[PDB]
Design a protein around this motif. Structure first.
Motif, PDB file in Angstrom:
ATOM      1  N   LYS A   1      -9.664   0.522   0.218  1.00  0.00           N
ATOM      2  CA  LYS A   1     -10.149  -0.729  -0.357  1.00  0.00           C
ATOM      3  C   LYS A   1     -11.665  -0.717  -0.510  1.00  0.00           C
TER       4      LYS A   1
ATOM      5  N   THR B   1      -6.129   2.168   4.833  1.00  0.00           N
ATOM      6  CA  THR B   1      -6.146   1.106   3.835  1.00  0.00           C
ATOM      7  C   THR B   1      -7.545   0.530   3.662  1.00  0.00           C
ATOM      8  OG1 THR B   1      -3.859   0.570   4.398  1.00  0.00           O
ATOM      9  CG2 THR B   1      -5.134  -1.088   3.181  1.00  0.00           C
TER      10      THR B   1
ATOM     11  N   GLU C   1       0.866  -1.176   0.000  1.00  0.00           N
ATOM     12  CA  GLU C   1       0.000   0.000   0.000  1.00  0.00           C
ATOM     13  C   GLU C   1       0.905   1.228   0.000  1.00  0.00           C
ATOM     14  OE1 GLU C   1      -0.472  -2.626   1.970  1.00  0.00           O
ATOM     15  OE2 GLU C   1      -2.510  -3.332   1.592  1.00  0.00           O
TER      16      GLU C   1
END
Lengths: 235, 241, 239, 211, 239, 240, 211, 217, 212
Positions: free
Chosen positions: I153, I149, H159
């Motif tokens: 997502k 994150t 990420e």
């Protein structure tokens, strides 16, 4: 650990039960003593009438003999026992040596009794401290104090019981040769000192004086009212 | 890593492991609560001094009696419990007078110290008498007097052990006061020097600034009897310092 | 708990557990004694166990003579038994001195039992861990059998046992008195021996038991010889 | 509580059966189990000297340096040892339950004193519960062997490049053999310790409050 | 744990040891060392004194009970003083009653009884002091030791106090010559023996040594700091 | 469990454990044995020599409690000496009042009762000594008695006390003391003591023996040293 | 039925013979052997760069077989029989001591307390040794997981360092484990030898003739 | 038990080796280690003031607002300090093991009395065992550092858009340096504490039951 | 052997004694001053946390650009971390000092030891709290990264947006209380040691002796 028996010393050598008895003294009603040049004045606060109680039965100030009196702060029953024992010792001393007791002699005896109760387990210390006042043969005023531990010390002026710290600070400030000059001034000083710690002035103080060669006089409530009125007015 | 079980310190008549008998040791710790007292033995005499530790101004200074007279020849200075001190002083006085009665003479300082020590020993309760305090006497005494052997200073402790000492300090600052004693002391010093040195040490240890009121001082010299320095004499010496 | 470990303190159910432990102390010895009364005789039997050969068999005995006409058998701690025996002898002689006649068996039992009571009430001393059974002849009442216990109970009995097999033995004796026909001297001794032998399963020999008897004909307490004991034992086996 | 006649009969038959089973377990089954575990220990399979011998064949293709996985069976040796030991484990757990309830039924009415008997009973049942928890731990490890070996074999097959997973599978088999042998030994030890404690303290266990 | 069984003298331990008596026996180890040894004509006591500080005088470790007996102490000075008073009064009583010096063996027997009484009873602690008793009587020179446990011994030589094992081993290896020694040789041997106990930095001095001698012609005399210099001068040095 | 702390207490199962703990005291002691034969009673003690410094003829465990009786002790020596003083007082009081030498059975009973006094009370512990008493009188005969810390008293043809009691007892058991005479019994006592002595654990011992019998005209006395040496040499020879 | 007691007594006599043989011969021999092994140059390595093993993963600008650390697996292969041995012997002495525990009583509980002291030491030893058993499997699994992480993410180098660090940690842990096993044998021998009299005969007969 | 002569010799060899090694440790190794450790602490590598300097460049391609990562190295400073400290941890663990074995061999046969020396011995054993557990925790942290930084760097690279993973990587390195300085000074403290307790209580530890006393028996 | 070894450990002990004395004299007071000053600063104390809210540049549903850490929180954390390291180091120093001052075990007269034990317990509790803070910083970074994150997502899920905001706010108030705790730890440690210094320095006290 080390606070359950009188005999046992603590680490650092503190005997704590006698300290606890000295703490028990603090719970009691205030008492104050002051040495005037020709008077010794002993003042004690009064807790409350309760309106169905007879005031005569309860008297903190007591006369051991013609020339000696005491006031106490602490356990009332213990005070009664100690007062009686000191009285019989006074009369016994007069019997033995054909002379009146000195104030230091009687405070020594009372201290020795309290000490005798401290030293041995199976007996608890007398939970009282006392203020003994008298005039000696020379005529000098004498004021002594005793505690549950059994040490005795002369004081120019002192207090015992609850609020003793505050009133003695006030007395350290106020007391001087000027105040002791007048008998009325001595009485007014002790009255003001008790007024420093008491709910109401006249109702809640019982005061007494001993003069040079006179018996104890418990001042009348009217006389105490007059003195507090004189004290109140001056402010 | 701390092991604090003790579990044997409580109650006299109990030997702890390693056989130390801790109640007596705690009593010996107790005198450190007391006011510092100091004694110096010299050829000219023995002097005793102590800090009064006046709590309040209203308390009469004379009433505090941490130096007293057992007899003309012997005086005592005490630090620790005032009450049991008074008891031991009474024992000393009566024993001196009993000796005078029986033998028409004056006791030695060692004999008087032994006499009081025997009373101190009775905490063990070997005797069956009820009137003996179970706890050890929580006081240390300094016995100073001029005897057939001259000036002598004896130390007594809660255990009842006693020893002669050329100079000793008891009480709170005995640690450190004894070091100052060890450096200053020499056997030849006169009583004037001893008085000055003892007052120096007392000034050092005392929290309050030294004044005629807060100290008590005494000396017994061969010609003189036990004497207490008055307010004026104390003023003179504390000015001289 | 802590309600045990001192005789004085009562349990929350008021039971005084310490004396009850003293009762167990009797059974800890591993010996049994039986006493049975008869019309003209009273007998006491007890096990005699010699742990070592070296022990002098004569010295070891649980049968003692409190006075000429009273005998006892002690069960429990040997030392406490001997002490109680001495106290009983002193009480009997003192009774004779003060009152001019031999102490009755019941009064001796009462004195010993109330002493046991002062033990079970005062703190520092412990109840003696022993049980006494006294046998004697009283002219008015005939034979007598009595038992002291550590508590101070002193009740009289027709027949009794003490020790580890007490419940079995009293069950046996209870049946025998229930089928009451009589007990002469021989039947009295036989009943005692059969009770002890049956409850223990021992099938005794003369050395293993010691018997003492009193009889109206011969009031003095006597401890029978091994020969007399074997005479009684053989008679038991024959029939 | 009012006791019906049938209810009294039911409780009585339960108590009777429990006490009978306790005597039977202590005196007949337990020594038989001890001798059985002795001979099982003496068997050759359970005292294999070389643990590398029971190293199983794990056939997964070594990746060529820079195809598919066939069926991978479990180790027959440790599986057979499991087949032997697992009945004994569950059997001991059952008999432990029997002893526990037997002791609990022998516990008397609560009273202030004469409590040393109940103290002994509590000590014995505490040890029995300890034996039971150790036995349950053996059951947990027996269950864990299959899942752990499956995870290791699956990880090795999924990641053939890393050989440490194959070494791990072989280690799991070796540790399983050692643990199973230890299980048999300590099962025998637990049976013997139960007999020792109960036989030694039987008088107080059956009759705690004196008579 | 076993913190229990240590509280009082009256509690036996599960292995037959009274732990308070042993804890009292530890007390002698605390004190400064002492040594005693005898010849055919003399008995000697020698001591290592300790001082609280430089200014303080050294403590008295040797005390005279009578002309024919004197003691040296290791352990509590209080118990030492008490027992010495008892011994002195016993000897005075013997001289008053029988007009003979008390036998030293009999005196230590009396000490043993008096010391034993505390150990068995609740109350007074065991006397936590160890004494070496040395005297001459008609039988001859004698040396005894008494423990805080009332048991006492008769010794050719002995050392009590801190680090006394060194003195004991010196005495044992040199013991044979002691019996025929002169008093000077004997006191020198004892001085070396106590010198073993001292720290290596410390050495014998006039101040810290006291010597006690008694014999057929010599009453018990304690030779003090100035008087020990004749005996000390002979000694050579540390090895 | 607070039951074992005091002797006033009883265990819940009827046991006074302080007394048993005191009985464990004597087992710490070195062994001592006394054997009774036709002529009289012989006593023997294995007195371990703790140090060369200690004088010989010291730490005596054989005491004379009266002219006609002797006492041998195992357990705490302080308690034993005190018990010996008690027994001597009892014997002297018996002579003063009843006019003759105390019977041994009676003396054993009195000292046993004195011992038994202590097991009862909480303030005071049981004695830590077990001791044997022996006497010979032409009327009573040879008598040997042993008193445990409990106050139990019994008469023993042969007896042992201390650490090696059991081994000493079997060795005494295979002796036939009843027929034998004292001058042989001293030799066999020496043999038994030398047997039971453990050289590894105990460095050395000095055999201390005494007897009473007709050969003394009924006075307990320490063995003459010639007879001691003869018995000791015999014991060393038999030991092999 | 006394047949059960007979069987358990035969088992106890066997255990007593075994533990005596152990204390006499096996424990000293294993102490000497383990001391020799730790003194061996193999597990005393001055520089661990020699211990470092290759990783065949390519660095970024599918991996080949990543073999385990040969040195560590060799040292582990000789280590693990020692751990198994000491655990088995510990269990044997533990069950021997358990069967010597006497009847529960409220007095004379010395020797019993001695047994409890020996038991707590044995319990600590058992926990440590089974911890060693667990640690070896942890090493294999963790190294495999680290290698898989590195292969999945070659860009990460900390996984490379993690594998090497696991290797050196295992080597040092093997050294400390050998010291632990030697010390365990030694202290167990010392304690058992010093207290064998009480451990074998905790109580004895104190009844005498009191009652 | 029956003991062979070889068995007695082996046991005696182990005992003498253990005792002389303990003496050598306490009197030679420990002060040498103290001087070495305080020199390490005084050295500048462990004395870094600005811990942002310790930050190592993390080369991950930041995404553009709307390439594969290179080899990402570990923080060389931290890795070098790890190389220094880890043998010290293992050695302290080894010497603690030696000390427990030494004391355990010194404790006497169990007896009812004279238990105070045994109490001191077992208390010292407990304290050194605590130190052993602490160093075991330290080595656990050492492994945790590598694993945590590795997974943090992997997550940051996967990420890339989230920056706080990169911040976490730098944070792990910084915390590692701080913890490692704490570890080494703690090691010095543990060595000095071991010496202090053992030296102060040595007479009881070495000779718990004490000198033989005259028999009461 | 090795009186020189005792000398070396004594040198270390004397260094610790003088260091802790200077520390109590100067370092702890000035650190208390500095930390209360840091508390009083407006950066640490903010009226509204909407100001603290930092941009999350995820696009909403009808690949994201760099999502940066909360700069305010990061700056305040950079200020905080030296204080945590400092207080932990000083606490370790004084703990080692007290440990060295523990006396030889004695069966009695252990009250002086008991004072040391209580003070040591306080120090241990402080150490645990401070280590917890040092871990909490890394926890904050990890949790914020996980939440960011998750948001990227699953952009549809807004609760992850609120989660990143809530984590930021929680960390801000947490570091406020942490700075308070560092100050209070310095103060209370100083107070304990200063009040009990005599017993901590000399637990057994002078062995007056003379009973023997």
């Amino acid at each position: 650990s080390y606070d359950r028996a009188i005999t046992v010393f603590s680490p650092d050598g503190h005997l704590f039960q006698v300290e606890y008895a000295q703490e028990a003294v603090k719970k009691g009603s205030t008492a104050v003593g002051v040495r005037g040049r020709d008077i010794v004045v002993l003042g004690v606060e009064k807790k409350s009438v309760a309106k169905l109680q007879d005031e005569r039965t309860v008297r903190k100030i007591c006369a051991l003999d013609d020339n000696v009196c005491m006031a106490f702060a602490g356990l009332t029953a213990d005070a009664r026992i100690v007062i009686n024992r000191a009285r019989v010792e006074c009369q016994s001393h007069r019997l033995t040596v054909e002379d009146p007791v000195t104030v230091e002699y009687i405070t020594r005896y009372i201290a020795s009794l309290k000490q005798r109760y401290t030293q041995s387990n199976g007996r608890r210390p007398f939970g009282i401290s006392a203020l003994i006042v008298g005039f000696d043969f020379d005529g000098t005023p004498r004021l002594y104090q005793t505690d549950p531990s059994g040490t005795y010390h002369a004081w120019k002026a002192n207090a015992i019981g609850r609020g003793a710290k505050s009133v003695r600070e006030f007395l350290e400030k106020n007391y001087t040769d000027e105040a002791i000059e007048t008998d009325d001034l001595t009485i007014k000083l002790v009255i003001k000192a008790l007024l420093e710690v008491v709910q109401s002035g006249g109702k809640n103080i019982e005061l007494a004086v001993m003069r040079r060669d006179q018996s104890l006089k418990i001042l009348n409530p009217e006389e105490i009212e007059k003195y507090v009125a004189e004290i109140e007015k001056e402010k | 890593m701390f092991l604090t079980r003790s579990e044997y310190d409580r109650g006299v008549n109990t030997f702890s492991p390693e056989g130390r008998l801790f109640q007596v040791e705690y009593a010996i710790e107790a005198i450190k609560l007391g006011s510092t007292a100091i004694g110096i033995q010299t050829s000219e005499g023995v002097c005793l001094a102590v800090e009064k530790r006046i709590t309040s101004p209203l308390m009469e200074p004379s009433s505090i009696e941490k130096i007293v007279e057992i007899d003309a020849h012997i005086g005592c200075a005490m630090s620790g419990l005032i009450a049991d001190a008074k008891t031991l002083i009474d024992k000393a006085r009566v024993e001196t007078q009993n000796h005078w009665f029986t033998y028409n003479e004056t006791m030695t300082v060692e004999s008087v110290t032994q006499a009081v020590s025997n009373l101190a020993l009775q905490f063990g309760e070997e005797d069956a008498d009820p009137g003996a305090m179970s706890r050890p006497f929580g006081v240390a005494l300094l016995f100073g007097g001029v005897d057939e052997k001259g000036p002598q200073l004896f130390h007594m402790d809660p255990s009842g052990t006693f020893v002669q000492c050329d100079a000793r300090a008891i009480g709170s600052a005995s640690e450190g006061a004894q070091s100052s004693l060890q450096e200053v002391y020499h056997k030849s010093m006169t009583l004037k020097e001893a008085i000055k040195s003892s007052l120096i040490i007392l000034k050092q240890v005392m929290e309050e600034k030294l004044n005629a009121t807060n100290i008590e001082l005494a000396t017994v010299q061969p010609g003189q009897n036990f004497h207490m320095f008055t307010k004026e004499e104390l003023e003179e010496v504390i000015k001289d310092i | 708990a802590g309600f045990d470990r001192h005789i004085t303190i009562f349990s929350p159910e008021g039971r005084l557990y310490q004396v009850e432990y003293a009762f167990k102390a009797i059974n800890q010895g591993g010996l049994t004694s039986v006493a049975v009364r008869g019309k003209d005789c009273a007998v006491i039997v007890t096990q005699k166990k010699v742990p070592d050969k070296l022990l002098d068999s004569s010295t070891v005995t649980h049968l003692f003579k409190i006075t000429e006409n009273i005998g006892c058998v002690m069960t429990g701690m040997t030392a406490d038994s001997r002490s109680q025996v001495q106290r009983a002898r002193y009480e009997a002689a003192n009774w004779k001195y003060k009152y001019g006649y031999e102490i009755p068996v019941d009064m001796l039992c009462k004195r010993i039992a109330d002493i046991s009571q002062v033990y079970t009430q005062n703190a520092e001393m412990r109840p003696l861990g022993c049980c006494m059974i006294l046998i004697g002849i009283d002219e008015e009442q005939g034979p007598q059998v009595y038992k002291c216990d550590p508590a101070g109970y002193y009740c009289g009995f027709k027949a009794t046992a003490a020790g580890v097999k007490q419940t079995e033995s009293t069950s046996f004796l209870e049946k025998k008195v229930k089928k009451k026909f009589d007990w002469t001297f021989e039947q009295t001794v036989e009943t005692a021996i059969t009770c002890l032998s049956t409850v223990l399963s021992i099938d005794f020999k003369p050395s293993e038991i010691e018997v003492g008897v009193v009889t109206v004909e011969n009031p003095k307490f006597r401890i029978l010889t091994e020969a007399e004991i074997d005479a009684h034992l053989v008679a038991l086996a024959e029939r | 509580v009012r006791l019906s006649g049938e209810a009294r009969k039911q409780v009585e038959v339960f108590r009777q059966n429990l006490f009978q089973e306790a005597e039977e377990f202590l005196y007949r089954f337990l020594p038989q189990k001890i001798i059985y575990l002795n001979q099982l220990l003496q068997e050759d399979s359970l005292n294999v000297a070389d643990l590398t011998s029971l190293r199983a064949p794990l056939d997964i293709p070594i990746p060529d340096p820079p195809h598919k996985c066939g069926f991978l069976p479990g180790n027959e040796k440790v599986l057979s040892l499991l087949a032997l030991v697992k009945p004994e484990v569950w059997t001991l757990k059952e008999k432990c339950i029997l002893v526990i309830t037997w002791i609990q039924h022998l516990i008397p009415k609560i009273e202030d004193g004469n409590d040393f008997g109940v103290a002994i009973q509590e000590k014995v049942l505490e040890r029995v519960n300890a034996v039971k928890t150790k036995v349950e731990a053996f059951q947990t490890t027996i269950s864990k062997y299959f899942s752990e070996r499956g995870d290791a074999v699956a990880k090795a097959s999924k990641e053939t490049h890393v050989m440490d997973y194959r070494a791990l599978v072989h280690e799991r088999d070796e540790a399983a053999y050692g643990e199973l042998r230890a299980m048999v030994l300590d099962l025998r030890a637990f049976y013997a310790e139960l007999y020792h404690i109960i036989s030694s303290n039987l008088e107080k266990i059956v009759n705690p409050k004196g008579e | 744990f076993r913190n229990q069984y240590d509280n009082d003298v009256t509690v036996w331990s599960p292995q037959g040891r009274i732990h308070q008596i042993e804890y009292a026996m530890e007390a002698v180890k605390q004190g400064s060392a002492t040594v005693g040894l005898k010849s055919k004509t003399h008995a000697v006591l020698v001591a290592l004194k300790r001082a609280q500080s430089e200014l303080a005088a050294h403590q008295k470790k040797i005390l005279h009970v009578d002309n024919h007996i004197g003691i040296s102490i290791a352990g509590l000075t209080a118990d030492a003083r008490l027992l010495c008073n008892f011994m002195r009064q016993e000897c005075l009583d013997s001289r008053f009653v029988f007009d003979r010096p008390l036998p030293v063996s009999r005196l230590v027997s009396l000490i043993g009884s008096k010391t034993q009484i505390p150990t068995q009873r609740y109350g007074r602690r065991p006397y936590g002091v160890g004494l070496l008793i040395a005297g001459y009587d008609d039988m001859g020179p004698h040396i005894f030791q008494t423990c805080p446990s009332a048991n006492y011994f008769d010794c050719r030589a002995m050392s009590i106090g801190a680090r006394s094992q060194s003195a004991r081993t010196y005495l044992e290896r040199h013991m044979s010559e002691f019996m025929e020694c002169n008093l000077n040789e004997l006191v020198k041997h004892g001085l070396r023996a106590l010198r073993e106990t001292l720290p290596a930095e410390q050495d014998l001095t006039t101040k810290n040594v006291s010597i006690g001698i008694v014999g057929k012609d010599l009453e018990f005399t304690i030779y003090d700091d100035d008087d020990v210099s004749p005996f000390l001068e002979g000694l050579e040095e540390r090895p | 469990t607070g039951y074992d702390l005091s002797a006033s207490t009883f265990s819940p199962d009827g046991r006074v454990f302080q007394v048993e703990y005191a009985m464990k005291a004597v087992e710490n002691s070195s062994t001592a044995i006394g054997i009774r034969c036709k002529d009289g009673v012989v006593f023997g003690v294995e007195k371990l020599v703790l140090s060369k410094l200690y004088e010989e003829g010291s730490n005596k465990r054989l005491f004379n409690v009266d002219r006609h009786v002797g006492m041998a002790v195992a357990g705490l020596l302080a308690d034993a000496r005190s018990l010996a003083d008690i027994a001597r007082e009892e014997a002297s009081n018996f002579r003063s009042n009843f006019g003759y030498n105390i019977p041994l059975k009676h003396l054993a009973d009195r000292v046993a009762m004195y011992v038994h006094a202590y097991t009862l009370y909480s303030a005071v512990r049981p004695f830590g000594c077990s001791f044997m008493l022996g006497s010979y009188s032409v009327n009573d005969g040879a008598q040997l008695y042993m008193i445990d810390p409990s106050g139990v008293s019994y008469g023993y043809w042969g007896c042992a006390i201390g650490k090696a009691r059991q081994a000493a007892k079997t060795e005494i058991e295979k002796l036939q003391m009843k027929e034998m005479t004292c001058r042989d019994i001293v030799k066999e006592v020496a043999k038994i003591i030398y047997i039971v002595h453990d050289e590894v654990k105990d460095k050395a011992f000095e055999l201390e023996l005494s007897w009473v019998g007709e050969l003394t005209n009924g006075r307990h006395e320490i063995v003459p040293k010639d007879i001691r040496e003869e018995a000791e040499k015999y014991a060393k020879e038999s030991l092999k | 039925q006394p047949e059960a007691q007979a069987k358990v007594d035969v088992f106890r006599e066997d255990l007593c013979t075994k533990t005596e043989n152990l204390l006499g011969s096996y424990f000293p021999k294993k102490i000497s052997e383990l001391d020799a092994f730790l003194k061996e140059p193999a597990l005393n390595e001055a520089n661990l760069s020699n211990l470092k093993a290759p990783l065949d993963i390519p660095v970024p600008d599918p991996c080949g077989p990543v073999n385990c650390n040969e040195k560590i697996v060799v040292l582990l292969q000789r280590l693990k029989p020692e751990i198994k041995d000491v655990i088995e012997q510990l269990n044997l002495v533990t069950t021997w001591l358990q069967l010597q525990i006497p009847r529960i009583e409220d007095g004379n509980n010395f020797g019993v307390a001695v047994q409890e002291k020996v038991f707590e030491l044995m319990t600590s030893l058992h926990t440590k040794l089974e911890g060693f058993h667990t640690q070896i499997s942890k090493y294999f699994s963790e190294r495999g997981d680290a290698v898989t992480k590195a292969a999945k993410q070659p860009h990460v180098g900390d996984y490379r360092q993690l594998v090497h660090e696991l290797d050196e940690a295992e080597y040092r842990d093997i050294r400390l484990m050998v010291m632990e096993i030697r010390n365990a044998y030694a202290v167990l021998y010392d304690i058992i030898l010093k207290n064998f009299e009480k451990l074998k005969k905790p109580r004895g007969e104190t009844k005498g003739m009191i009652y």
